[PDB]
Design a protein around this ligand. Structure first.
Ligand SMILES: [Zn+2]
Lengths: 176, 76, 60, 141, 49, 117
RNA sequence: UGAUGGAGGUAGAGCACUGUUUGGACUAGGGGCCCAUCGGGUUACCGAAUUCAGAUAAACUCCGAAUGCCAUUCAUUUAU
RNA sequence: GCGGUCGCCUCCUAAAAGGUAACGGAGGCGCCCAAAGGUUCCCUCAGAAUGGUUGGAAAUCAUUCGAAGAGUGUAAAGGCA
RNA sequence: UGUGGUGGCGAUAGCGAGAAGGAUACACCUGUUCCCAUGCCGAACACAGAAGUUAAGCUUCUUAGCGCCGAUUGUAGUGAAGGGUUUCCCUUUGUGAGAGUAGGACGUCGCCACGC
């Protein structure tokens, strides 16, 4: 892709210069994207889960899981075994291409351009971004009729805020 | 008018064999309910967690490091 | 990849009102436009020409 | 009839105890304290009386330490009910004191008000007392 | 609810075995490859009607 | 992200296999050890802890690539060095592994050359 | 009787767990009353996260005694 | 006499082998499961902190700490990572 | 002597913190057509590989901060023998714990292989 060759050519050695790694094996990388859609309303209607799986299968290349319940609470009106959410793991080359799509397409479909929200800090290279909405090219008005969103959990091998910021920054992520 | 005073019966646990006995085949050694002592050489566990004596010999008790103990038989 | 359980997606090229960067993949289809050997030999019909170049984080 | 120091039960009844002997358990917080020299139960209300006879010589507060608290319960039958059936109703909250748990402690006040306060405290408890400082202390930080 | 039940050798026709079922979970008649004493052979046993 | 190093789980599965029966007085163990490049084998009693016969993957005589190719060769050489000492009823260690290659070749080549299972 | 071996949770300690509980420090933010009608949150319990010293228990245990108890091709004495 | 109780199972009383009464102190039982059984593989929990769209202290997520603070069809002991 | 595999002995073997190494070896590491796999996912599992590195693991060495093992004392309790009030305490003879430690402790022993 674009980004692997960016690693092999330009992204790595400047980050090596900023911190003086005695081995190239200490280049921090990008592993995962976890995508989640908690619903809550699908307990009332089993037809709510009919569409989110379709949307996530269109945005990703995978059918997501159908997540369990882990609890039994009537104050949140849940038994065990309740189908609530949907996980998408992402590895390999679809990682980089989905981040390419996030750079080129998603972020210029945001109302009220102010920048990517910084404060996902967490110390240990774990930036998550809530997504509220039609921010994707594989989506119709006449198909999507709900106000569902998305979830991004990118987990790295970095150890600071700063190295994680520069991993996300040399690859994109236009923060505020 | 009390709502108490009702009992189980004494089911008579505890070791029924010393160290250094001369023990025939199959006789019980230490009757449990719950694994308090694991078996060792030539000793098996019954359905109700008792202990046997397969080979004829001498009962001796040991350790398993720090926590729990063993029973084993050594023949002549 | 476990079989029979995945949607369809292909090397779908991008086109754009600013220069049409011909690089990436996608899933949607349509009319055969850029079956071009240096790039994805498939549909380029990711053609919402919202640029990520006319917006003043990339633009200034 | 109001109990100064109730508990949270876990159990309505307990056995009637059997107290022999203790020792040690020196003055820790304050500077002037009693020592029980005997062995009895001590009920709730005696500690109220000890509080009030402590404080009504104390002026503008001072320092009051209570180091003994009721835990256990009594029962009793009615009047005229034969021997026979189950235990009586739980009434009161009592805790035994052996030879030498320090009853209370005082500090911040010179000795004379302190010894008056401890004489007033000792004449409302059924146990003989003494008066102790941090007398022989190698641990004083 | 739960009724005592006896099995049936499907060849020599003797009431061999006995077990228990819960007849709202399992309204049918069971089929297990049990043993036969009279024949010394594995035989598909079924519920006595 | 922590990545648990793979010998830990291999040794956990060993300890959850070895605790049934070693029984190695006259019917000793076999032993099977992966790497990223080679294969090792030992035949041990208890509680002397002595390997009576052994053979590497590619430290004595090779055949080809570090494959099932080698595994058949090692399963040859172990039993060929073994039955000279008179061993018949050896017991497998599964290691902490499963059976999709590089181990069952050793198993089958241990079967044909004189070792009973 | 003497020697040797183990079975075990009694007396006392009884803090580590589960119950009952005494005073200090700390805030993380509950702080009802705030200054309020834009940042300082003033007092109080500082309760839970803690963290100090200090008690305690038939159905509490990190530990744990004398004695009896079961056995020994063991030794002495005695008569079952 | 009126009341209460009559068989079985756990714990304390029970004096550290076993046994041991009182109209002493406490809780259950007269079932359930065709897999909640047998074998063979694989796996490790409750919580706590920190961010994350509807999201609320507490649904679904991600990271770290964590010998158990969980679970074990059913009451209690004894067990079981 | 190193390095790897594999055993017992109560963590005196541990935890935490600090340093060095890549001969051979182990592992990370490049992939997935093949045997296989994912309740989705080459992360694992399984199969192919020799581009790169001691960065982590692994191995050696330092530390008594944490956890562990801890003598001799005394004291509480107690068999036997007694004595006063019998709620309870005291005296002879035998036996003695727990807390508190001075101290020990950053392993010991076994087999095989490959280099040295
Ligand atoms: Zn028949």
């Amino acid at each position: 892709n674009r980004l692997k060759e960016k690693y092999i050519k330009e992204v790595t050695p400047s980050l090596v210069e900023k911190f003086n790694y005695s081995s190239v094996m200490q280049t921090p990388k990008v592993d995962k994207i976890v995508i989640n859609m908690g619903v809550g309303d699908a307990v009332s209607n089993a037809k709510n889960l009919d569409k989110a799986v379709e949307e996530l299968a269109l945005i990703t290349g995978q059918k997501p899981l159908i997540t369990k319940a882990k609890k039994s609470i009537a104050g949140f009106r849940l038994r065990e075994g309740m189908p609530i959410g949907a996980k998408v793991t992402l590895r390999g080359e679809r990682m980089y291409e989905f981040l390419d799509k996030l750079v080129t397409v998603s972020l210029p479909r945001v109302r009220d351009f102010h920048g990517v929200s910084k404060k996902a800090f967490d110390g240990r290279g774990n930036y998550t971004l809530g997504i509220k909405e039609l921010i994707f090219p594989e989506v119709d008005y006449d198909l999507v009729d709900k106000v569902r969103g998305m979830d991004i959990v990118i987990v790295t091998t970095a150890n600071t805020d700063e190295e994680s910021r520069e991993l996300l920054a040399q690859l994109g992520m236009p923060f505020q | 008018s009390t709502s108490n005073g009702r009992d189980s019966e004494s089911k008579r646990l505890g070791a029924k064999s010393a160290d250094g006995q001369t023990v025939t085949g199959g006789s019980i050694l230490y009757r449990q309910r719950g694994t308090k002592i694991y078996p060792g050489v030539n000793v098996g566990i019954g359905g109700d967690d008792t202990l046997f004596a397969k080979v004829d010999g001498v009962v001796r008790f040991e350790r398993k490091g720090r926590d729990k103990k063993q029973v084993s038989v050594y023949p002549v | 990849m476990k079989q029979d359980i995945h949607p369809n997606y292909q090397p779908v090229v991008f086109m754009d009102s600013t220069t049409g960067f011909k690089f990436l993949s996608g899933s949607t289809k349509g009319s055969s436009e850029t079956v071009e050997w240096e790039d994805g030999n498939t549909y380029p019909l990711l053609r919402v020409e919202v640029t990520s170049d006319s917006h003043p984080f990339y633009t200034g | 009839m109001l109990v100064p120091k109730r508990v949270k039960h876990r159990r309505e009844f307990r056995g009637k105890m059997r107290g022999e002997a203790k020792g040690g358990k020196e003055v820790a917080f304050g500077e002037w304290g009693l020592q029980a020299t005997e062995s009895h139960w001590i009920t709730n209300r005696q500690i109220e009386a000890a509080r009030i006879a402590m404080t009504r010589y104390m002026k503008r507060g001072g320092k009051v330490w209570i180091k003994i608290f009721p835990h256990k319960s009594y029962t009793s039958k009615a009047i005229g009910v034969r021997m026979g059936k189950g235990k009586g109703a739980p009434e009161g909250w009592v805790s035994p004191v052996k030879r030498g748990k320090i009853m209370f402690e005082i500090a911040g006040v010179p000795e004379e008000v302190a010894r008056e306060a401890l004489r007033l405290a000792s004449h409302k408890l059924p146990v003989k007392t003494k008066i102790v400082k941090r007398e022989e202390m190698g641990g004083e930080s | 609810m739960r009724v005592n039940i006896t099995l049936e050798c499907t060849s020599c026709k003797e009431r061999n075995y006995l077990t228990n079922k819960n007849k709202r979970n399992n309204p049918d008649r069971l089929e297990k490859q049990k043993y036969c004493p009279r024949e010394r052979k594995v035989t598909l046993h079924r519920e006595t009607k | 992200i922590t990545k648990p190093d793979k010998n830990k789980t291999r040794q956990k599965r060993h300890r959850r296999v070895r605790n049934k029966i070693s029984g190695t007085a006259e019917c000793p163990r076999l032993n099977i050890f992966r790497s990223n490049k080679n294969i090792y084998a030992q035949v041990i009693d208890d509680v002397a802890g002595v390997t009576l016969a052994s053979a590497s993957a590619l430290d004595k005589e090779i055949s080809g690539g570090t494959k099932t190719e080698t595994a058949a060769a090692v399963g040859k050489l172990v039993a060929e060095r073994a039955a000279e000492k008179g061993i018949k009823k050896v017991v497998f260690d599964r290691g902490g592994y499963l059976y999709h290659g590089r181990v069952q070749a050793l198993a089958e080549a241990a079967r044909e050359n004189g070792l009973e299972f």
